[PDB]
Design a protein around this motif. Structure first.
Motif, PDB file in Angstrom:
ATOM      1  N   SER A  32       7.402  15.233 -23.956  1.00 59.75           N
ATOM      2  CA  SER A  32       7.215  14.837 -22.238  1.00 59.75           C
ATOM      3  C   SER A  32       5.487  15.535 -22.211  1.00 59.75           C
ATOM      4  CB  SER A  32       7.984  14.896 -21.425  1.00 59.75           C
ATOM      5  OG  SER A  32       7.955  16.087 -20.851  1.00 59.75           O
ATOM      6  N   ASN A  33       5.186  16.712 -22.684  1.00 56.88           N
ATOM      7  CA  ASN A  33       4.167  17.626 -22.468  1.00 56.88           C
ATOM      8  C   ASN A  33       3.009  17.013 -22.820  1.00 56.88           C
ATOM      9  OD1 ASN A  33       3.522  20.812 -21.761  1.00 56.88           O
ATOM     10  ND2 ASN A  33       4.143  19.747 -19.895  1.00 56.88           N
ATOM     11  N   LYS A  34       2.383  16.575 -23.454  1.00 62.10           N
ATOM     12  CA  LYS A  34       0.847  16.530 -24.819  1.00 62.10           C
ATOM     13  C   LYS A  34      -0.306  16.649 -23.841  1.00 62.10           C
ATOM     14  CE  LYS A  34       3.044  15.761 -27.654  1.00 62.10           C
ATOM     15  NZ  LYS A  34       3.224  17.428 -28.704  1.00 62.10           N
ATOM     16  N   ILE A  35      -1.233  17.317 -24.534  1.00 60.54           N
ATOM     17  CA  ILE A  35      -2.163  17.523 -23.926  1.00 60.54           C
ATOM     18  C   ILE A  35      -3.441  16.782 -24.914  1.00 60.54           C
ATOM     19  CG2 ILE A  35      -1.320  18.800 -21.629  1.00 60.54           C
ATOM     20  CD1 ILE A  35      -2.692  21.738 -24.604  1.00 60.54           C
ATOM     21  N   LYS A  36      -4.767  16.132 -24.112  1.00 64.00           N
ATOM     22  CA  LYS A  36      -5.873  15.915 -24.721  1.00 64.00           C
ATOM     23  C   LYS A  36      -7.635  17.119 -24.012  1.00 64.00           C
ATOM     24  CE  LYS A  36      -9.051  11.979 -25.173  1.00 64.00           C
ATOM     25  NZ  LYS A  36      -9.150  11.509 -26.433  1.00 64.00           N
ATOM     26  N   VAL A  37      -7.967  17.757 -24.372  1.00 65.71           N
ATOM     27  CA  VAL A  37      -9.268  18.118 -24.062  1.00 65.71           C
ATOM     28  C   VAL A  37     -10.482  17.803 -23.820  1.00 65.71           C
ATOM     29  CG1 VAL A  37     -10.348  19.733 -24.501  1.00 65.71           C
ATOM     30  CG2 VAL A  37      -8.682  20.643 -25.209  1.00 65.71           C
ATOM     31  N   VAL A  38     -10.392  17.536 -22.638  1.00 63.28           N
ATOM     32  CA  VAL A  38     -11.615  16.628 -22.084  1.00 63.28           C
ATOM     33  C   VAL A  38     -12.497  17.306 -20.923  1.00 63.28           C
ATOM     34  CG1 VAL A  38      -9.992  15.538 -19.529  1.00 63.28           C
ATOM     35  CG2 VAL A  38     -12.142  14.439 -20.834  1.00 63.28           C
ATOM     36  N   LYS A  39     -13.920  17.040 -21.488  1.00 60.91           N
ATOM     37  CA  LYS A  39     -14.747  17.311 -21.000  1.00 60.91           C
ATOM     38  C   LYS A  39     -15.358  16.661 -19.777  1.00 60.91           C
ATOM     39  CE  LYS A  39     -18.110  18.207 -22.748  1.00 60.91           C
ATOM     40  NZ  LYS A  39     -19.296  19.639 -24.449  1.00 60.91           N
ATOM     41  N   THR A  40     -15.329  17.544 -18.142  1.00 60.78           N
ATOM     42  CA  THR A  40     -15.669  16.360 -16.953  1.00 60.78           C
ATOM     43  C   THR A  40     -17.418  16.585 -16.181  1.00 60.78           C
ATOM     44  OG1 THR A  40     -14.987  18.760 -16.120  1.00 60.78           O
ATOM     45  CG2 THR A  40     -13.068  17.218 -16.490  1.00 60.78           C
ATOM     46  N   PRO A  41     -16.941  16.405 -15.294  1.00 59.20           N
ATOM     47  CA  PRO A  41     -18.356  16.071 -14.998  1.00 59.20           C
ATOM     48  C   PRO A  41     -18.944  17.784 -14.178  1.00 59.20           C
ATOM     49  CG  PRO A  41     -17.731  14.396 -13.952  1.00 59.20           C
ATOM     50  CD  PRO A  41     -16.673  15.143 -15.088  1.00 59.20           C
ATOM     51  N   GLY A  42     -18.095  18.265 -14.498  1.00 59.27           N
ATOM     52  CA  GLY A  42     -18.593  20.155 -13.775  1.00 59.27           C
ATOM     53  C   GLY A  42     -19.163  20.703 -15.144  1.00 59.27           C
ATOM     54  N   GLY A  43     -18.842  20.301 -16.658  1.00 59.97           N
ATOM     55  CA  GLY A  43     -19.564  20.495 -17.373  1.00 59.97           C
ATOM     56  C   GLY A  43     -18.106  21.619 -18.124  1.00 59.97           C
ATOM     57  N   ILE A  44     -17.241  21.772 -18.018  1.00 62.43           N
ATOM     58  CA  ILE A  44     -16.181  22.442 -18.642  1.00 62.43           C
ATOM     59  C   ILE A  44     -14.967  21.745 -19.370  1.00 62.43           C
ATOM     60  CG2 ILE A  44     -16.488  24.344 -16.831  1.00 62.43           C
ATOM     61  CD1 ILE A  44     -13.559  23.441 -15.508  1.00 62.43           C
ATOM     62  N   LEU A  45     -14.621  22.048 -19.944  1.00 63.47           N
ATOM     63  CA  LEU A  45     -13.240  21.749 -20.739  1.00 63.47           C
ATOM     64  C   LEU A  45     -11.714  22.063 -20.572  1.00 63.47           C
ATOM     65  CD1 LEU A  45     -14.646  22.048 -24.035  1.00 63.47           C
ATOM     66  CD2 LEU A  45     -13.270  19.986 -23.504  1.00 63.47           C
ATOM     67  N   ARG A  46     -11.275  20.939 -19.978  1.00 57.87           N
ATOM     68  CA  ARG A  46      -9.965  20.849 -18.814  1.00 57.87           C
ATOM     69  C   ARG A  46      -9.135  20.032 -20.217  1.00 57.87           C
ATOM     70  NH1 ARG A  46     -11.371  21.613 -13.731  1.00 57.87           N
ATOM     71  NH2 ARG A  46     -10.356  20.214 -12.874  1.00 57.87           N
ATOM     72  N   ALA A  47      -7.607  20.792 -19.986  1.00 57.55           N
ATOM     73  CA  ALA A  47      -6.675  20.434 -21.262  1.00 57.55           C
ATOM     74  C   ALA A  47      -5.627  18.982 -19.836  1.00 57.55           C
ATOM     75  CB  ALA A  47      -5.784  20.932 -20.612  1.00 57.55           C
ATOM     76  N   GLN A  48      -6.650  18.038 -19.783  1.00 59.08           N
ATOM     77  CA  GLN A  48      -5.789  16.709 -19.333  1.00 59.08           C
ATOM     78  C   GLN A  48      -4.142  16.082 -20.305  1.00 59.08           C
ATOM     79  OE1 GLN A  48      -8.225  12.634 -20.145  1.00 59.08           O
ATOM     80  NE2 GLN A  48      -5.870  11.908 -19.580  1.00 59.08           N
ATOM     81  N   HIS A  49      -3.272  15.908 -19.291  1.00 65.27           N
ATOM     82  CA  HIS A  49      -2.073  15.689 -19.637  1.00 65.27           C
ATOM     83  C   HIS A  49      -2.133  14.036 -20.438  1.00 65.27           C
ATOM     84  CE1 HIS A  49       0.624  19.278 -19.111  1.00 65.27           C
ATOM     85  NE2 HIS A  49      -0.413  19.808 -18.935  1.00 65.27           N
TER      86      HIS A  49
END
Lengths: 100, 63, 91, 77, 50, 50, 112
Positions: free
Chosen positions: G16-33
């Motif tokens: 129940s805790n999977k994560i994808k690594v996504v690049k956001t308009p801020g230019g940084i990479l964050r772990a979306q759930h």
RNA sequence: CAAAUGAGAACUUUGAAGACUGAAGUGGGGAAAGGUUCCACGUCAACAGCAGUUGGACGUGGGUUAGUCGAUCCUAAGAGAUGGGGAAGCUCCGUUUCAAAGGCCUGAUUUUAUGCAGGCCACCAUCGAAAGGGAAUCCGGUUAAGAUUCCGGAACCUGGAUAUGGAUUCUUCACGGUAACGUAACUGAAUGUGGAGACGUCGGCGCGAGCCCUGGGAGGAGUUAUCUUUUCUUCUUAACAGCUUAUCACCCCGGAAUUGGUUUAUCCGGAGAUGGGGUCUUAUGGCUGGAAGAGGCCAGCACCUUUGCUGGCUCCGGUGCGCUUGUGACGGCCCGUGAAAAUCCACAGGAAGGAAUAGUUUUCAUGCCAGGUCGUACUGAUAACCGCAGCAGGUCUCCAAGGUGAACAGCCUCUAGUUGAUAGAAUAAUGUAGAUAAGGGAAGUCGGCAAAAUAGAUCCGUAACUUCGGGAUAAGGAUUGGCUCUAAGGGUCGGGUACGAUCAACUUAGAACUGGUACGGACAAGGGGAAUCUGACUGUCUAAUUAAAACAUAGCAUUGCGAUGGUCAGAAAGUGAUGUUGACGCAAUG
RNA sequence: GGUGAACUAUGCCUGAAUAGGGUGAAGCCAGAGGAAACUCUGGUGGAGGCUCGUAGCGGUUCUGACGUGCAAAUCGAUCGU
């Protein structure tokens, strides 16, 4: 596709300050710009022109503002104009030399 | 510069090998490339009509 | 291609457990991993899920059968016996 | 957000009487290098949705913005 | 822990409120012998272990 | 935990409209979707509950 | 390479805790759930995937309209076309068998 | 090293150097635990085993903002009231059993009323997970400290309320497709049924995301005695909405041995394959909206005025046995086959209701309101936890760049972090740790104990014995650098009606030349053989002197038991384990 | 008469973690020999309470360090897996 790219260099400020000569500058460009990596390939594909205060280069072959900045920096280091002249971009391919 | 040298073929002698042949490049993946190339060529020939389905099947088993 | 002389499927066990035990395990392992005819569709598609569970995947059916064979000799014998008794009772 | 490509559907949306504000966003878009055109986007703000109508024709944009009633709160940027 | 319960939060609040030095005017009240807070606590020194 | 397969079988409730599921011990030869018969008057077949 | 972190308080690689690594308009990479994937509804007769029906979680089925949860055929969102056809054929043929068996029983009773 | 602050600086701060951790970190967060240790301002009496101007210390204050993240809800292992039965009794058993165990809908429409002319059942308390199941939020900005919680924008779910847009009326509850099926909708009570929730592990293959690599171009920074179209860096698009996109699967048309199709992996096809056409799944990808107005990269102009504003760019590609992650179609394994429940849909059935300005749909679209309570700061460890402590110990987990190399080995570096361990004085003996040594080579010693030798990879060769599987890397040998080359690997495009260009470069061979015969040049990396005793092996134990030949083990054998039973619990019981069991089983043994 | 399974022992329930190589089992594909019976050779494939070896788990030897210790059991090298 094959359209010629035009790059302008404004040397007005150093010319007014009287430490840098556009004639020798463009001579250095015309003898140091290399196309295809060797000599004999500069068959009017890349041309440099001086009006006295602005140096205009026209290139149908490969040539970039990065290359132009690299060559200008090399010339400035050779003639010891660094720390006095900055190669600045105002808009696309309309570079200038600043004193500040 | 080193990658350009490797591309030309230097620094790849027995004194530079440290892993086994399979550890460096699997014989399994070499066989996969071989069989896929041969099957693709056979299918291309069959589709173009250079060889009929029976010869294609015989060649497919041989491949 | 015969890669091994007599160990067959028991090459996974290699050297351990003893030759006689490995031979018995071999006989039962070929029996349990073999493919069997399906009496309903006629295709060699009956696999074993667990002991006594034999699934035919083509026709999507499940049969109750021996731990390592689709039908045991004892099962066949009782089938014949109950068939005989049913026929005698009926006639 | 929801894309809008139909002028009459945009007209009905602005006639919905639930939407009050529309943002006219002007963009400099390039379809062919020799024709840098004035894209514009009419972003109507509903109660659950932001409907962005897209046009690429300056004349059609001008006609639409002239046809927009003056009661609607228009914000040009 | 970060994920506490209200009882533990209340206990920590009470401990925080108690963990203060004694006021200097109780020192000046007459017929008084109290000089310092003898029940003073530090997180490294003594764990309340609640 | 048991060496024998089990059989989920379904009968009709004779008194109320609903289905009753039973857990039999599968006899050899019993296959899925098969009519088994349970009762005094059932026929002598494998799987029947005479 | 920028490194990411869980946004929730759960520090464990559970289902129940999977994560994808996504690049956001801020230019940084964050772990979306990312959460559980949906499984296609299955036929109650053959168990195969029911084609024509959306695959969502049960509450998404609740919030989704009726069209995506069923097919226009009888036993639409419950059984597949092949199973429905087989049971229709079975119903009709077994009813016909019962009728002819009934008339056979009647005629043999009348004869005897 | 310098400067600043200070009475005072090896220890504080800033800058300049030199270094290290080197992405299973000395980085960025979290679980348990701690409880303010977080942060600011003063501040050095005690503590920081030296010092201190500094601090996790002292004094005073500030700080934790949620309909969407958790708890709350469900149930698992289990705990546990009730009925009832034991016990002198504290209390024990028992959880559905020997119990009279019970709550929501159109509802009669106005003094009544979950009393009512009415209707059905059968879980038969409750607790139990901040890692299982689960309704719903993302981006950007903001603080001394909080942010998926604040602000701005853009969404979604649940509950409630409710009106407008869209199909029928002398076919009342749609239509089209051949069919898989498709729509914006397109009544549906009791009752029954199905699905989702809902599942192991390993191997290869395919696809995607992120990262790595790389070309052009735009913008900055570094080198520039000399050479580098050069080295580094920015060029980014979130939840959510629409359209379009796949394996697998399915449908229609002909009806196939000369068997064909086809995977890396050999599996399908008259129970209908090839072939042609089509349908379906939202993983995934693409195009838009969000949204460039954001954020970043630059240049320029006002100017103690809680300080600002303009201009330009943010664009096209490519490659792969690359790393990690996810997904898909699959294969292997089991005497092992890898929770439940809440909850939510759907389907059978047809109860009831419905017709020319009046009724049927709030499962189509839009519109209105609300979403309570507790947690949220910080550390998470060579200093915030436990170990008497700021203890070389212990303590669960997520992300993981470049080079060499087979390698999240060892070694060096980028981002980030640290530079913390009392210091100074060329160091005597003896130590601790690391190493060399001529000739001999175990003569030492209880004993080759400790060290040395060996070591990677490619070729050649490999004995006794054997349970034919091994032994085996047996034993032994030979090469390995650099440079310049050469040859084997690989997709599209056709002939008026016998044939060839662009385009990754990554694995193997071969040759020449070359040098102090050096070349797995650091790192890293088996010593081997001939036999005896013993235990078959894999595995386990005396935490803190014994890892063994001891114990387990599979295998073998014996014994008891057919349920009113065998073995064993309980003080007793209308009490228990095996037992959700039944001799291919359970129990007791060797 | 009471307290403890926060260490540890064992059984359940629910989660999580485990680079690279070596060997090459079944199952398949293609050939060769032979009169047959049958035998043989390459390739594929990726099994094992296999093996070398990281993380991890453990603790053989130095009877090394320390032995009023960093530590009422730790540190280093060498080791088992």
């Amino acid at each position: 596709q094959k359209i010629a790219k035009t790059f302008t260099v404004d040397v007005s400020s150093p010319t007014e300050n009287g430490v840098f000569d556009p004639a020798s500058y463009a001579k250095y460009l015309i003898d140091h710009i290399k196309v295809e990596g060797a000599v004999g390939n500069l068959g009017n594909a890349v041309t440099v022109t001086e009006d006295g205060t602005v140096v205009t280069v026209v290139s149908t072959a490969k040539f970039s503002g990065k290359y132009l900045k690299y060559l200008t920096k090399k010339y400035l280091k050779k003639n010891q104009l660094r720390d006095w002249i900055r190669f600045v971009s105002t808009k696309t391919n309309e570079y200038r030399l600043a004193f500040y | 510069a080193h990658a350009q040298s490797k591309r030309e073929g230097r620094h790849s002698g027995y004194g530079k090998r440290k892993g086994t042949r399979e550890a460096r490049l699997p014989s399994q993946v070499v066989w996969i490339r071989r069989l896929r190339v041969l099957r693709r060529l056979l299918a291309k020939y069959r589709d173009a009509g250079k060889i009929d389905k029976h010869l294609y099947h015989v060649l497919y088993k041989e491949s | 291609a015969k890669r091994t002389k007599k160990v067959g499927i028991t090459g996974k066990y290699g050297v351990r457990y003893g030759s006689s035990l490995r031979r018995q395990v071999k006989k039962l392992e070929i029996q349990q991993h073999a493919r069997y005819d399906c009496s309903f569709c006629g295709k060699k598609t009956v696999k074993r899920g667990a002991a006594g569970i034999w699934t035919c995947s083509c026709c999507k059916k499940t049969v109750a059968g021996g731990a390592y064979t689709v039908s045991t000799a004892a099962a066949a014998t009782v089938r014949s016996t109950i068939r005989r008794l049913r026929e005698m009772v009926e006639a | 957000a929801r894309e809008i490509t139909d002028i009459k559907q945009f007209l009905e949306l602005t006639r919905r009487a639930d939407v009050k504000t529309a943002t006219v966003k002007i963009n400099k878009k390039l379809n062919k290098a020799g024709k840098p055109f004035r894209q514009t986007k009419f972003k109507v703000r509903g109660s659950s949705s932001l409907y962005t109508l897209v046009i690429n024709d300056a004349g059609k944009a001008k006609k639409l913005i002239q046809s927009l009633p003056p009661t609607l709160k228009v914000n040009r940027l | 822990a970060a994920q506490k319960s209200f009882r533990i939060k209340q206990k920590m609040a009470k401990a925080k409120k108690q963990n203060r030095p004694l006021p200097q005017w109780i020192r000046l009240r007459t017929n008084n012998t109290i000089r310092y807070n003898a029940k003073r606590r530090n997180w490294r020194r003594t764990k309340m272990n609640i | 935990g048991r060496g024998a397969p089990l059989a989920k079988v379904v009968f009709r409730d004779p008194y109320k409209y609903r289905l009753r599921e039973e857990i039999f011990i599968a006899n050899e030869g019993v296959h899925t979707g098969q009519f088994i018969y349970a009762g005094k008057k059932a026929s002598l077949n494998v799987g029947n509950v005479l | 390479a920028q490194r990411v972190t869980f946004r929730r308080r759960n520090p464990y690689n559970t289902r129940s805790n999977k994560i994808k690594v996504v690049k956001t308009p801020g230019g940084i990479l964050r772990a979306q759930h990312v959460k559980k994937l949906a499984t296609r509804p299955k036929c109650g007769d053959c168990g195969s995937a029911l084609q024509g029906i959306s695959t969502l979680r049960p509450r998404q089925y609740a919030t989704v309209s009726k069209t995506h949860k069923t097919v226009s055929r009888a036993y639409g969102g419950s059984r597949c076309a092949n199973c429905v056809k087989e049971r229709i054929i079975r119903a009709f043929l077994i009813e016909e068998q019962k009728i002819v068996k009934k008339v056979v029983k009647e005629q043999t009773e009348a004869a005897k």
